[PDB]
Amino acid sequence: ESADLTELYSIIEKTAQVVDVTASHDKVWPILNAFQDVIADSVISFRASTGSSADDLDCRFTMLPKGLDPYARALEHGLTPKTDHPVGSLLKEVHENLPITSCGVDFGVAGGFTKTWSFPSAEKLGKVSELVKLPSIPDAVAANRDFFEKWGIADMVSTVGIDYSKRTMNLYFGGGVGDRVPAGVFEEKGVRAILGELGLAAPSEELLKFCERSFVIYVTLSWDSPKINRFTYSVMTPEPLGLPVDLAPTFERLIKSAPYDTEGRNYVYGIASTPKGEYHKIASYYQW
Ligand SMILES: [Cl-]
Ligand SMILES: [Cl-]
Ligand SMILES: [Cl-]
Ligand SMILES: [Cl-]
Ligand SMILES: [Cl-]
Ligand SMILES: [Mg+2]
């Protein structure tokens, strides 16, 4: 399957160029070699960003099997260094104490290994009450326990992302046929209240219209701040050109001119609110 990795690299290099990023052969090939045994059956997607994060393109391999510890694999191959910071111990704690059924890894095509993904199945979700007991959890989860309880989302953790490069964590809520994020989270009063409570930028008119199409949210937390770092609404659609947003030129190019067919496939779009403003994300699915 060495020639398979060669085609995949060639797709990664070109897709990077579509969004004005240059892939690093020296960073990406070790990752392809490290995960060669799980790439064929993985879901592979490319995620572009506006704002500061526009300087790299993320590549994600998801739906990786139970029995792969993707952080351990990255450590084993020297793709990321050992650390005593709790970020390095959280994955194992989450995998034991939340009903995780598959996983994933995430890398910048220029920057190298950045994140792991831990996925419960939609039929049985994770709980904030179990997260707050984990030795390596950010203190900010319990520090915002009021927020998760207020908005009725504490028992519907649907994905955990761990970013080793930034020392942040993402908690997703909602998705698939699982428990639903309450409707009030997506109505204007709710969007204003949430962003206000979290000290984030007041929602734009574009964000309000986008929120009407959303049923997945995720919260970004860190170990070094008691405050939620950002709040992101997500929308899944096979017609991203029809989203009620103005698309960045790089996003339009990724939709229209990727080196592969996404005919029919869903894209995943996000709008992140921070204390300074709104930044967008779009994921295109190469292998599904
Ligand atoms: Cl993110
Ligand atoms: Cl509801
Ligand atoms: Cl996103
Ligand atoms: Cl998203
Ligand atoms: Cl910011
Ligand atoms: Mg259910």
Author numbering: 3 to 290
Could you pull the original sentences from the published paper?
The PT EpzP from Streptomyces cinnamonensis DSM 1042 reported here is a member of a new type of bacterial prenyltransferases, as it catalysis the prenylation of a phenazine substrate. EpzP is a soluble, monomeric ABBA PT consisting of 302 amino acids with a molecular mass of 33.2 kDa. The overall structure of EpzP belongs to the PT-fold family and is characterized by ten antiparallel β-strands that assemble into a circular β-barrel. The β-barrel houses a solvent-filled reaction chamber in which the substrates bind and the regioselective Friedel-Crafts prenylation of dhPCA takes place.
